[PDB]
């Protein structure tokens, strides 16, 4: 019940073993990403095992997708049957239309949560990482120090628990 081998992981392994269809497995993966990944995760309960669990879940989705999809689709369609290039161009469009760095980070992060392979094909995904990332940094690193910590904390919307400074 340690670091690399514990009840939680065993549990998800068995859980994952009962995913006989692509739609089910794919949907569970996306749901898992919404629930346990990124600073916007719905919960931090699986903080110590989610990274490993997610990978094991991706494994199932990839295997199922390969058996279900025909060659062209495996290369150009997402696990949800969506046209990969569309999603990519669409998301990039929204990113460029981003008003500020706050809307931008929401676009990029969500993109990762919903399309991270084996959902979207790696080629499109990393092509996306390339464009979304460039825009996000540009907006974020502009006058990076102007906003003082006192206000930035509020903009982030964090709950200040304790402060010390001699």
């Amino acid at each position: 019940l340690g670091i690399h081998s514990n009840d939680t992981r065993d549990a998800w392994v068995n859980k994952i073993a009962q995913l006989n269809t692509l739609e089910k497995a794919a949907e569970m993966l996306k749901q898992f990403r919404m629930d346990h990944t990124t600073p916007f995760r719905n919960s931090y309960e699986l903080d110590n095992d989610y990274l490993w669990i997610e990978a094991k879940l991706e494994e199932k989705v990839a295997v199922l997708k390969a058996r279900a999809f025909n060659e062209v689709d495996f290369r150009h369609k997402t696990a949800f049957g969506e046209d990969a290039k569309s999603v990519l161009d669409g998301t990039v469009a929204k990113m460029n239309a981003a008003k500020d760095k706050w809307e931008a980070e929401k676009i990029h992060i969500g993109f990762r949560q919903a399309y991270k392979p084996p959902i979207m094909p790696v080629n499109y995904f990393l092509d996306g990482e390339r464009q979304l990332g460039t825009r996000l940094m540009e907006l974020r690193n502009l006058n990076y120090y102007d906003t003082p910590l006192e206000e930035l904390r509020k903009q982030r919307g964090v709950r200040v628990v304790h402060l010390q400074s001699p």
Binding site: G2, I3, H4, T38, P39, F40, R41, S43, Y44, D47, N48, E105, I109, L126, D127, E129, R130, Q131, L132, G133, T134, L136, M137, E138, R140, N141, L142, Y144, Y145, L149, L152, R153, Q155, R156, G157, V158, R159, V160, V161, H162, L163, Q164, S165, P166
Partner: protein, 510 residues
């Protein structure tokens, strides 16, 4: 009909054109900067000539190691403290070299000029050589040294302790994760230029003073290569100095790069040098000041002033929180000695005198504490005492900076004592300075590294060590030790009997 040939210089005269423009001839990586495709590299090399100059260096190096040094028993006649220190220095630098490989591969992808790509390529192969060289130091000390454990499995035993996490930040993730230009600065413009290099030399010095002729033999060889990456360091600031974005982004990634690097090495290096050695070379306080001022923050950076480059705005802060940083850290490292993969020793009489002489006030704080721990039997397995207990008993919480991963204890520190705690979407976050705090507040998704207290929360010490193989061959004696003598070594049992169960210190604010 005379005997003629062709050399690298002559063939490299045409390498610049090797690249041809087309549809998607562009970088696959996100970056705010645009690298001019007209950039040239300082050294006119081709694979063949690169291989040759490197092979000649290998000959000398391995020749010395396998022959004369082995005959002189150089792997053994080293001070115990240093034998241990090299397990950390060599393996930690090994990962810095290894990630430098991937990072320069990324820079290679970013460069559009064939020559700038070629410059990085040479570095990709150099960093691979350095990975293998650092690996060889551990390999050699394990084969011929006084204590193989740690040297023989650092790649897996390094994962038990907290010091390792910050290493992946400055020399791993900080090297490959983020804007290629940001990673470029973390590696070359700041990492290599400000620390890595002057550091490599220093290591050879501290090593020689402690009987280690193995490290100088290898590291001096690594330096020769690095003298080339330096010249290639400006090449990255030149291919963007024109792009308008650079005049609006460079200084920020550089400031964050500087802080990130010094946040870790300022404390760790001084610590490894002053506390991992017997014989001293130079007080870290004076070394750091020279490196981070008359050298980097002064001479080296000042020349880049004509490209816009401005001195880090966090330079004043860094020097402030530095004087006692390494001393402050050792108290923590020692207190959590069972989580290491190397043996630690407490300052002896001459050393305390040396420390006081060089850092007035040192004794009344650190000196007294170490004598207290020693008298209470922290080195004896039958005392049932490990300094971690002293921190708990005296209410001195130990946190891990969510950003730099550096351990800090505000209520005991003689250096920086500022602490900031926040709660965001169900998770608590602890910070040790205004710069790391900013980085997190703005880039929350870039910093989600779990700390040892989080992963080990609720776990009993001896169990974490056992699970992660923190033991020597006998399957009972700990790799880590609170002293460097050959007798009275601590065993797993000795630890289990302590009944230490980890707690996530942040929750005391609930």
């Amino acid at each position: 009909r005379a005997p003629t040939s062709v050399n690298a210089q002559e063939v490299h005269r045409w390498l610049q054109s090797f690249n041809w423009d087309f549809k998607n001839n562009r970088t696959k990586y996100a970056t705010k900067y645009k690298m001019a495709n007209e950039t040239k590299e300082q050294f006119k090399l081709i694979a063949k000539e690169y291989a040759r100059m490197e092979a000649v260096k290998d000959e000398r190096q391995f020749g010395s190691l396998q022959d004369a040094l082995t005959r002189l028993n150089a792997g053994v006649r080293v001070h115990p403290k240093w034998n241990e220190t090299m397990k950390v220095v060599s393996n930690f630098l090994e990962v810095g070299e290894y990630n430098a490989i991937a990072a320069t591969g990324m820079l290679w992808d970013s460069a559009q000029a064939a020559e700038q790509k070629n410059g990085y390529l040479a570095q990709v192969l150099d960093e691979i050589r350095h990975t293998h060289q650092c690996a060889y130091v551990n390999y050699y000390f394990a084969k011929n040294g006084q204590d193989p454990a740690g040297h023989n499995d650092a790649r897996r035993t390094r994962t038990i302790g907290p010091l390792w996490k910050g290493m992946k930040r400055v020399f791993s993730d900080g090297f490959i994760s983020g804007d290629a230009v940001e990673c470029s600065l973390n590696l070359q413009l700041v990492g290599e230029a400000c620390f890595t290099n002057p550091l490599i030399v220093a290591v050879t010095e501290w090593a020689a003073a402690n009987g280690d002729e193995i490290t100088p033999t290898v590291f001096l060889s690594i330096e020769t290569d690095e003298l080339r990456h330096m010249a290639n360091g400006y090449q990255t600031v030149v291919s963007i100095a024109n792009d308008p974005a650079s005049a609006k982004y460079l200084n920020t990634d550089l400031n964050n790069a500087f802080w990130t690097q010094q946040k870790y090495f300022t404390p760790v290096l001084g610590m490894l040098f002053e506390y991992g050695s017997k014989f001293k070379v130079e007080p870290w306080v004076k070394t750091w000041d020279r490196w981070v001022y008359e050298d980097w923050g002064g001479i080296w950076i000042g020349r880049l002033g004509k490209y816009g480059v401005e001195s880090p705005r966090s330079l004043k802060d860094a020097k402030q929180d530095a004087y006692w940083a390494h001393h402050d850290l050792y108290l923590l490292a020692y207190a959590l000695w069972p989580t290491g993969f190397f043996r630690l020793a407490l300052p002896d009489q001459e050393e305390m005198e040396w420390f006081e002489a060089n850092y007035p006030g040192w004794y009344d704080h650190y000196g007294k504490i170490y004598e207290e721990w020693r008298a209470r039997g922290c080195e004896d397995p039958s005392s049932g005492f490990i300094p971690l207990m002293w921190f708990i008993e005296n209410n001195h919480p130990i946190y891990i900076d969510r950003v730099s991963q550096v351990p800090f204890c505000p209520s005991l520190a003689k250096g920086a004592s500022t602490l900031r705690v926040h709660e965001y979407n169900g998770e608590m976050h602890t910070f040790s300075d205004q710069w790391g705090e900013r980085m997190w507040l703005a880039e929350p998704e870039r910093y989600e590294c779990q700390n040892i207290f989080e992963q080990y929360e609720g776990r009993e010490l001896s169990e974490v060590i056992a699970e992660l193989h923190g033991l020597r061959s006998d399957g009972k004696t700990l790799i880590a030790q609170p002293h460097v003598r050959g007798d009275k070594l601590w065993t797993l049992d000795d630890i289990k009997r302590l009944n230490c169960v980890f707690k996530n210190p942040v929750k005391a604010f609930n």
